Design a protein around this motif. Structure first.
Motif, PDB file in Angstrom:
ATOM      1  N   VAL E  19      23.428  26.608 -23.019  1.00  0.00           N
ATOM      2  CA  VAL E  19      24.749  26.197 -23.514  1.00  0.00           C
ATOM      3  C   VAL E  19      24.731  25.549 -24.894  1.00  0.00           C
ATOM      4  CG1 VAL E  19      26.793  24.821 -22.928  1.00  0.00           C
ATOM      5  CG2 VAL E  19      25.707  26.121 -21.124  1.00  0.00           C
ATOM      6  N   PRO E  20      23.811  24.568 -25.254  1.00  0.00           N
ATOM      7  CA  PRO E  20      23.933  24.001 -26.608  1.00  0.00           C
ATOM      8  C   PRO E  20      23.408  24.889 -27.723  1.00  0.00           C
ATOM      9  CG  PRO E  20      22.948  22.436 -25.136  1.00  0.00           C
ATOM     10  CD  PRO E  20      22.839  23.755 -24.497  1.00  0.00           C
ATOM     11  N   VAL E  21      22.724  25.981 -27.391  1.00  0.00           N
ATOM     12  CA  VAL E  21      22.405  26.925 -28.452  1.00  0.00           C
ATOM     13  C   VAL E  21      23.538  27.937 -28.616  1.00  0.00           C
ATOM     14  CG1 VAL E  21      20.931  28.329 -26.905  1.00  0.00           C
ATOM     15  CG2 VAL E  21      20.625  28.492 -29.369  1.00  0.00           C
ATOM     16  N   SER E  22      24.209  28.327 -27.533  1.00  0.00           N
ATOM     17  CA  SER E  22      25.237  29.346 -27.645  1.00  0.00           C
ATOM     18  C   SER E  22      26.551  28.773 -28.139  1.00  0.00           C
ATOM     19  CB  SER E  22      25.457  30.037 -26.308  1.00  0.00           C
ATOM     20  OG  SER E  22      25.949  29.112 -25.362  1.00  0.00           O
ATOM     21  N   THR E  23      26.872  27.530 -27.769  1.00  0.00           N
ATOM     22  CA  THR E  23      28.088  26.900 -28.271  1.00  0.00           C
ATOM     23  C   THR E  23      27.980  26.579 -29.748  1.00  0.00           C
ATOM     24  OG1 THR E  23      27.172  24.865 -27.375  1.00  0.00           O
ATOM     25  CG2 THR E  23      28.943  25.923 -26.146  1.00  0.00           C
ATOM     26  N   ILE E  24      26.774  26.319 -30.234  1.00  0.00           N
ATOM     27  CA  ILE E  24      26.612  26.057 -31.653  1.00  0.00           C
ATOM     28  C   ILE E  24      26.595  27.363 -32.433  1.00  0.00           C
ATOM     29  CG2 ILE E  24      24.835  25.298 -33.285  1.00  0.00           C
ATOM     30  CD1 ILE E  24      24.504  22.829 -31.644  1.00  0.00           C
TER      31      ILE E  24
END
Ligand SMILES: *[C@H](C)[C@H]1/C(=C/c2[nH]c(/C=C3N=C(/C=C4\NC(=O)C(CC)=C4C)C(C)=C\3CCC(=O)O)c(CCC(=O)O)c2C)NC(=O)[C@@H]1C
Ligand SMILES: *[C@H](C)[C@H]1/C(=C/c2[nH]c(/C=C3N=C(/C=C4\NC(=O)C(CC)=C4C)C(C)=C\3CCC(=O)O)c(CCC(=O)O)c2C)NC(=O)[C@@H]1C
Ligand SMILES: *[C@H](C)[C@H]1/C(=C/c2[nH]c(/C=C3N=C(/C=C4\NC(=O)C(CC)=C4C)C(C)=C\3CCC(=O)O)c(CCC(=O)O)c2C)NC(=O)[C@@H]1C
Ligand SMILES: *[C@H](C)[C@H]1/C(=C/c2[nH]c(/C=C3N=C(/C=C4\NC(=O)C(CC)=C4C)C(C)=C\3CCC(=O)O)c(CCC(=O)O)c2C)NC(=O)[C@@H]1C
Ligand SMILES: CCC1=C(C)/C(=C/C2=NC(=C\c3[nH]c(/C=C4\NC(=O)[C@H](C)[C@H]4CC)c(C)c3CCC(=O)O)/C(CCC(=O)O)=C2C)NC1=O
Ligand SMILES: CCC1=C(C)/C(=C/C2=NC(=C\c3[nH]c(/C=C4\NC(=O)[C@H](C)[C@H]4CC)c(C)c3CCC(=O)O)/C(CCC(=O)O)=C2C)NC1=O
Ligand SMILES: CCC1=C(C)/C(=C/C2=NC(=C\c3[nH]c(/C=C4\NC(=O)[C@H](C)[C@H]4CC)c(C)c3CCC(=O)O)/C(CCC(=O)O)=C2C)NC1=O
Ligand SMILES: CCC1=C(C)/C(=C/C2=NC(=C\c3[nH]c(/C=C4\NC(=O)[C@H](C)[C@H]4CC)c(C)c3CCC(=O)O)/C(CCC(=O)O)=C2C)NC1=O
Ligand SMILES: CCC1=C(C)/C(=C/C2=NC(=C\c3[nH]c(/C=C4\NC(=O)[C@H](C)[C@H]4CC)c(C)c3CCC(=O)O)/C(CCC(=O)O)=C2C)NC1=O
Ligand SMILES: CCC1=C(C)/C(=C/C2=NC(=C\c3[nH]c(/C=C4\NC(=O)[C@H](C)[C@H]4CC)c(C)c3CCC(=O)O)/C(CCC(=O)O)=C2C)NC1=O
Lengths: 46, 160, 66, 169, 48, 48, 161, 97, 161, 161, 160, 161, 160
Positions: E19-24
């Protein structure tokens, strides 16, 4: 209730937790040295 | 091999190959059947050669298998049993090529610095090459132990 | 600094020259101690006769300080 | 790309000559093997989707460092990518087998392959073993089909070995 | 042989999609700051 | 020496020498070579 | 090979002005951490061959580059890879005493990224060796001193990338 | 858009070529040949840079600054000669005061 | 420099295995042709200067090139040319006994696309002098070797253009 | 572009082990400091243009850079220098929420030194520019998260020099 | 909305909504009762809040009140008093929509081009909604005042 | 693209001052020769296919660059080189009106030392072709305009070197 | 200039120059002697232009003199005329080139951020060049004010 945001901020950091520390450690081979390993295991009886 | 060692010696003098040099290639090419037949005895029986010379090194130098040693335990001895696979592969590359440059580029140049960084005593693994000369001559013929054993006496002086 | 003083005599040994070529034959250069074994191995390959070697500066057999 | 015929064209075009007696006999030497080239290329593509599967299971059973978490063939993200990246070496070996020389291999697969694998961390080492397990084999399905095998049907495979792998000696 | 080289700059493609790589990376390519609904992922994800 | 470097093995023999001994033996090892001494001499300014 | 002190001097040179309060505020911060920098750079020089023999043990040893085919196979390179690994430890120690990562660009990071492509040695495999070298120094000089050591280690692999 | 020298055509043509004459460690390791200074094509200022896979032993082919036949690759026994009127001026020390 | 003996060794070493039966079979294919290559070297080096003389008179002499205006005028630019054709003959016969054109990738064809451009040498005349050299050395060595001599001449001839 | 989630798991992937207790101790501090990370991220996005206005007023205006000859004289370049100064606030806040500085290694420090040495941008004026907004953000988001935001600015400023 | 911005990025990568990304909706449907408890407070207190923050605005910029300025007279206050009444409607629409996106579809994307033609100094209405931010946060709880202030601060950076 | 006008203005802009007497002193020499150059361009573009036809026939036809193995042999390459040499006639007329050789740096001369070694096309025959194209365009445009035309032909020949 | 806009419109079709378009270069040169006489006359009273036209700006815009606005004291109003001296330098750069492209690449292409990020509004600078416009006509003749006034309104059009 039903908070819009979550979590306790906490007192500190996350600043310098970046550097990991571990004994990798090293590389006892374990794979294609099996033939060599067998000879070494075999040699142990002497 | 024989010719590409003699080409790069004939390039620095900037001259074609001598008739005193070309018969060396002429003798080597015609005597190519015999040296391949030396090489299959190295490859076809090498599990006898490493296991006997490995036992001869650990009796001549029992300090290697001691605690506090480099090849101590089951795992760390197994690459010292596998390092002698590598040096025996360079001799059986050497006798087919007939010269020293397939041995010299692979295992001779950096070997003073390589085992220096790994912590092993360099002359002790070089002593096991000398024991590997003795077993590889014992399974060899009368003339063939002198010709193929000469590169074995290169390699002991390579590390030392 | 242990500076040697060497007196060499180097023949032409081929390639004869109409030049001066006296400084190349019989010279009296002075060399430091570290740069002499590379020098003395060079002076033998030209067939040079090393005539006189005298340690010009430096204590013979000292232990510390160059 | 550049056939053995068309390599002999600009071997003769740049010097500005016609087709002499040496041109007429080297080109006939290609054409007498052309029946043996094409029928070997059929049976290489007989089970070419199986031939990569028998090779890589024989690879990874031989080098088990490349399965356990080490060098990159670890997940099926790597392993099914490995079978595809193996399959280019089988498929382009079919083309240069028909084309005579290796100039199709020279500027379709070999150029940049030292620089693609270094940018990913893919080792060049067992890739040479992966072509070394196919070039000896490929010869099994040529032998079991009855076609002779030797001069060629390796002319292509070790040109993917002697020019991809870095020179040691 | 090979007679030239383009370069061999390390290129690394992710093995994952967390999630924090794809949302960024869905907010980098739109060329904007992290908007107020994109912070609502990480305020939910880190609380969970 | 008045020329460029000759290739790779002529330069790898110089790169390990300044890796171990330093710069002071790099400038030594150019000068006491055979190609300096027998192509220039011991009483000539070098030239390109 | 200008340091961090001459960097503030050269940044105050082109402006032409003297040393103001904010010009020396980045100068006392060197002198506060300077006793940590002089002490820790001795201990890396004391173990300058145990680090390199551990960093290649942590990543490169028994791997597939040491297998036949890879770059770490022939002794002739293996030893080049060790000597090239020996520079990055030493020039990190030169960088940490200077306080300036422009030690490395002027000296080691200028032509390194294309020389490694002219040999064909894998760049992305070198980065894990320098990343493992950053770990073993941080276990050696303590937790705080490995932070400023790890800045210049991360400067080399970013310039190599 | 700051790579001013073109990328692809300098290496699409180079694949058909043999190994181009440069320094062994890339074009950025090759100084401009002027009287002094040691200027270099800095690879980070304007990207000149172009690697090339060079061999284990290679000989760069160089031109003798002077007589054409007096290259040392033809006759190694002629490198001790003066280059004559074609080459640069050789100096030597004779008269010491 | 890769000999055809060493090319089978460099192929068989990087896989890690020893000498296979197929790899031994390639060396016996080289050794059966070894008599034909060493015959071709000694019949050239006795009269290597004669092949140079017979090749310039076939294609280059009495032309525009040897006249004023051309590039083989002014004997500085003629003694350099006669040793230049001596270089290709001396490096073909090294590539003959090596059985592999890897010498020509290393010591011959490096600058020759650019050094002839940077010296004003017309490539269109030296690429015909090579083919004229092949047509006299096929008559001098023989019909059997002159095809296999002609492989390593046309590797130079395609490398110049 | 790999984060603190990926860097922990890939540290345990190539080891082959599970999540060991040192790594959850790292992962506990990543998850419990989320409301510090959100509050820092929502306030820098609350005034993104105020921070970069006060940043150039801290260190860039009335220098020689703004005076003709300098590299911010035209209004093209003042918009360029202020777009690029915004980019080191966007990508710093991107690496803030992922917790790893590897976004800046892939995205912003790939060709940064290639650009600024091709336009002749003064690098030494930029390393005080990002150091200027290190004070401004830490006065805006607090001393806790400004210490956290100060690492990624210093990771940019280490790669800048 | 919070739904729509989370749809048009997951649609643009041609997948479904990934279940790490659904929880921004799963959270906000519980807090939708919070925002309708927030939006009812600001709408009823609006006609209170409009008649002092405009008067708070005119202290720091009085030349727009002066003749020559663009707000001169009672008929030239409804151009300005309704505009802050227009803007707080977009704030409460940003409360209920969850994210800032109804202001992007209504109230921000031509303000540089609008007030240039209307002759209004645009740096005042940013200060005018800065006056809106300071007194609307006082009317709610501090948990509401942090969340409702974040929609205000986009409208600060709208005209700046 | 820069003019002779913008080579006065921007040389007076990076100093940061207005137009002095020496700035207009370069303009008035350009305005006294502006009427000559506009007649000069419209008689070169009248015969642009006729300028190339003689200059190809003067420099390199019936030579050994068009005989096989020469680089201008095949009809791709013969139609390439006239299309290649049409740029140097056209981009000099683009710069003869501009009064400025810095037209050629942005468009022609930047990537021109490369992509000539990279295809192996001869530099020394191209500079021989430009320098004889100077002596056919002197007979059409007149003697005086060919001096101002010959500056930008020598600017091609210097930067191609 | 005309000439550097002539050539860059000929590269976009990769042709030679159009012969009717070659007359606009020939009209550019022969109408150049009266154009540079305009430029030195603006240069000869560039302080007399600025110290006059700055005074009629501040009576029109009292926000930048009464405290609360952007630029004040000696410390920023001298920087405010440092902007107007740059724009007056751009117009006499534009007159000798004939076009507005020296003003385009230098001084208008990023104006809508470098005051937008710097707090000051745009339109008073657009009232400043209009203040500079009225004193530029009064120094010149009738037709010379028509040509030189054609560059002043380009500054109004790009800013406001
Ligand atoms: C059979 C009942 C059991 C089994 C046996 C099995 N598997 C393989 C081969 C592979 N297994 C994997 C496994 C995974 N890849 C993944 O990405 C994941 C998720 C993290 C898993 C679990 C892979 C990549 C291979 C191929 C490479 C390899 O050889 O290991 C074999 C060998 C097959 C062969 O001989 O070719 C066998 C016998 N697999 C199961 O699922 C059962 C538990
Ligand atoms: C598997 C047996 C071996 C291996 C394979 C492996 N390869 C990749 C990735 C790529 N391989 C290529 C190669 C080519 N592309 C071409 O166009 C051609 C010429 C036709 C070749 C030879 C490329 C471009 C890639 C990158 C991905 C892509 O195809 O776009 C991987 C993936 C690396 C990863 O971990 O992501 C793998 C695993 N690796 C091995 O270990 C075996 C030796
Ligand atoms: C401003 C604070 C500093 C400055 C800026 C400046 N930059 C340029 C030109 C470019 N700047 C960039 C910047 C980035 N590119 C990226 O990809 C990233 C990471 C996402 C950043 C931060 C780029 C690519 C350029 C090229 C132009 C473009 O964007 O298309 C200029 C103009 C230079 C010129 O000569 O035209 C300026 C003025 N320079 C300074 O002086 C400030 C210190
Ligand atoms: C004056 C009529 C208006 C005004 C001016 C004002 N400007 C500033 C600050 C700056 N102004 C500039 C202007 C330009 N820069 C350029 O590069 C060009 C083209 C060549 C122009 C026209 C710049 C760069 C700055 C930054 C400071 C500097 O020059 O170094 C101020 C001060 C702002 C502050 O907060 O300090 C003022 C007052 N503002 C007005 O109100 C007038 C309408
Ligand atoms: C073909 C050229 C070639 C050489 C020379 C070579 C040497 C080599 N020896 C190694 C290890 C080793 N080698 C030894 C060998 C010995 N130690 C002893 O005590 C004995 C006296 C001696 C041999 C009889 C030991 C103990 C190690 C492990 C060192 C360690 O892991 O710390 C390793 C690291 C692990 C590996 O990849 O095998 C290399 C690369 N590898 C090569 O590919
Ligand atoms: C300009 C001042 C100057 C002089 C004079 C000079 C002389 C000189 N004479 C030499 C040799 C010689 N000189 C002679 C002399 C002769 N043949 C005989 O035997 C007779 C006894 C004599 C009759 C003329 C011989 C034979 C050698 C060669 C010695 C040898 O190499 O064996 C050599 C060493 C070889 C060489 O470099 O030439 C020098 C340097 N050098 C100088 O710089
Ligand atoms: C002063 C700055 C500087 C550095 C650091 C440097 C390295 C360097 N490494 C080289 C080769 C090499 N370098 C390596 C090193 C490595 N390959 C690997 O796989 C490992 C990741 C890594 C060792 C840690 C190897 C194995 C070679 C031999 C390549 C070959 O022979 O094909 C070469 C060409 C040979 C030579 O040294 O003469 C240079 C110039 N050169 C420099 O000028
Ligand atoms: C300007 C400097 C310069 C010189 C000197 C020069 C000489 C030169 N002389 C040549 C031939 C020749 N030169 C001669 C000349 C002679 N043969 C004899 O027997 C006599 C001893 C002698 C003169 C009296 C002959 C006979 C040939 C042709 C060879 C043949 O017919 O086999 C050739 C080859 C064909 C040609 O182009 O003429 C050259 C290049 N070239 C130059 O650029
Ligand atoms: C095989 C490796 C190899 C090549 C390619 C080589 C080329 C070579 N040719 C040269 C000169 C030359 N080479 C030629 C040769 C020719 N021009 C012609 O018109 C003829 C077509 C052709 C020969 C018949 C000429 C005329 C020069 C003199 C150019 C000059 O000195 O300016 C030079 C410079 C002087 C020297 O150092 O020898 C080199 C290096 N040298 C080598 O060792
Ligand atoms: C939310 C979307 C939205 C926008 C952008 C909007 C703008 C807007 N501003 C207007 C008037 C106006 N608005 C202002 C603005 C102000 N007065 C001041 O003194 C202050 C500086 C500032 C506000 C605090 C002025 C001065 C006028 C009249 C302009 C004129 O008469 O020339 C009008 C015409 C009359 C009206 O219907 O209100 C519209 C439509 N209306 C909208 O519904």
């Amino acid at each position: 209730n039903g908070g819009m945001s979550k979590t306790p901020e906490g007192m500190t950091f996350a600043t310098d937790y970046l550097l990991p520390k571990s004994t990798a450690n090293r590389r006892r081979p374990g794979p294609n040295m099996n033939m060599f390993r067998d000879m070494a295991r075999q040699m142990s009886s002497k | 091999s024989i010719v590409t060692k003699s080409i790069v010696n004939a390039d620095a003098e900037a001259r074609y190959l001598s008739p005193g040099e070309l018969d060396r290639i002429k003798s080597f090419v015609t005597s190519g059947e015999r040296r391949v037949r030396i090489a299959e005895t190295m490859t076809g029986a090498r599990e006898r050669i490493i296991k006997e010379a490995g036992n001869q090194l650990f009796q001549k130098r029992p300090d290697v298998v001691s605690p506090g040693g480099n090849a101590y335990g089951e795992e760390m001895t197994a690459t010292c049993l596998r390092d002698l696979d590598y040096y025996l592969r360079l001799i059986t590359y050497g006798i087919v090529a007939g010269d020293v440059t397939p041995i010299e580029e692979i295992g001779v140049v950096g070997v003073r610095e390589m085992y220096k960084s790994l912590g092993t005593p360099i002359e002790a693994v070089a002593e096991g090459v000398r024991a590997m000369k003795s077993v590889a001559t014992s399974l060899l013929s009368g003339e063939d132990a002198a010709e193929a054993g000469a590169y074995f006496d290169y390699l002991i002086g390579a590390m030392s | 600094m242990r500076s040697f003083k060497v007196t060499a005599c180097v023949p032409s040994q081929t390639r004869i020259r109409t030049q001066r070529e006296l400084q190349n034959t019989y010279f009296t250069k002075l060399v430091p101690y570290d740069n002499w074994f590379r020098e003395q191995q060079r002076i033998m390959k030209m067939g040079g006769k090393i005539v006189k070697v005298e340690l010009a500066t430096g204590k013979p057999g000292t232990n510390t300080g160059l | 790309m550049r056939d053995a015929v068309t390599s002999l064209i600009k071997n003769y075009d740049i010097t500005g000559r016609y087709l002499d007696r040496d041109a007429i006999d080297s080109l006939k030497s290609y054409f007498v093997t052309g029946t043996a080239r094409v029928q070997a290329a059929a049976t290489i593509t007989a089970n070419a989707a199986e031939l990569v599967k028998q090779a890589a299971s024989q690879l990874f059973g031989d080098l088990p460092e490349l399965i356990r978490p080490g060098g990159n063939a670890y997940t099926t993200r790597r392993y099914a990518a490995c079978l595809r990246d193996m399959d280019y070496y089988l498929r382009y070996a079919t083309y240069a087998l028909v084309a005579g020389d290796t100039d199709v291999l020279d500027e379709r697969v070999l150029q940049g392959l030292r620089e693609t694998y270094n940018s990913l961390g893919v080792p060049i080492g067992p890739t040479v073993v992966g072509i070394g397990i196919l070039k000896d084999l490929a010869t099994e399905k040529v032998q079991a089909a009855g076609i002779e095998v030797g001069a060629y049907l390796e002319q292509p495979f070790d040109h993917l070995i002697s020019e991809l792998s870095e020179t040691d000696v | 042989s090979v007679k030239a080289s383009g370069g061999s700059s390390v290129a690394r493609p992710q093995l994952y999609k967390t999630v924090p790589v794809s949302t960024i990376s869905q907010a980098e390519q739109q060329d904007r700051y992290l908007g107020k609904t994109e912070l609502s992922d990480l305020a939910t994800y880190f609380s969970s | 020496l008045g020329r460029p470097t000759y290739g790779r093995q002529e330069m790898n023999s110089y790169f390990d020498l300044c890796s171990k001994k330093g710069f002071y033996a790099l400038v030594d090892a150019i000068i006491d070579s055979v190609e300096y001494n027998e192509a220039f001499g011991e009483d000539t300014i070098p030239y390109e | 090979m200008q340091d961090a002190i001459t960097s503030v001097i050269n940044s105050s040179d082109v402006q032409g002005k003297y040393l103001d309060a904010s010009a020396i505020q980045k100068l006392k911060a060197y002198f506060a951490t300077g006793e940590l920098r002089v002490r820790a750079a001795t201990t890396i020089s004391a173990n300058a061959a145990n680090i390199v023999k551990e960093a290649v043990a942590k990543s490169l040893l028994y791997s597939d580059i040491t297998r036949p085919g890879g770059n770490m196979y022939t002794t002739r390179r293996y030893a080049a890879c060790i000597r090239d690994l020996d520079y990055y430890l030493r020039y990190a120690t030169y960088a940490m005493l200077a306080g300036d990562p422009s030690i490395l660009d002027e000296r080691v990071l200028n032509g390194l990224k294309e020389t490694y492509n002219s040999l064909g040695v894998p760049i992305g495999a070198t980065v894990q060796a320098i990343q493992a070298m950053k770990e073993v120094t941080a276990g050696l000089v303590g937790a705080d001193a490995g932070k400023e050591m790890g800045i210049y280690f991360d400067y080399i692999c970013s310039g190599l990338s | 858009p700051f790579r001013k020298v073109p990328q692809f055509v300098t290496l699409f043509g180079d694949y058909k070529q043999p190994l181009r004459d440069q320094h062994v460690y890339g074009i950025g390791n090759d100084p401009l040949e002027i009287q002094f200074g040691a200027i270099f094509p800095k690879e980070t200022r304007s990207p000149k840079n172009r690697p090339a896979p060079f061999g284990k032993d290679t000989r760069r082919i160089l031109i003798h600054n002077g007589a054409g036949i007096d290259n040392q690759l033809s006759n190694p026994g002629a490198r001790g000669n003066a280059p004559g009127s074609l080459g640069p001026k050789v100096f030597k020390l004779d008269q010491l005061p």
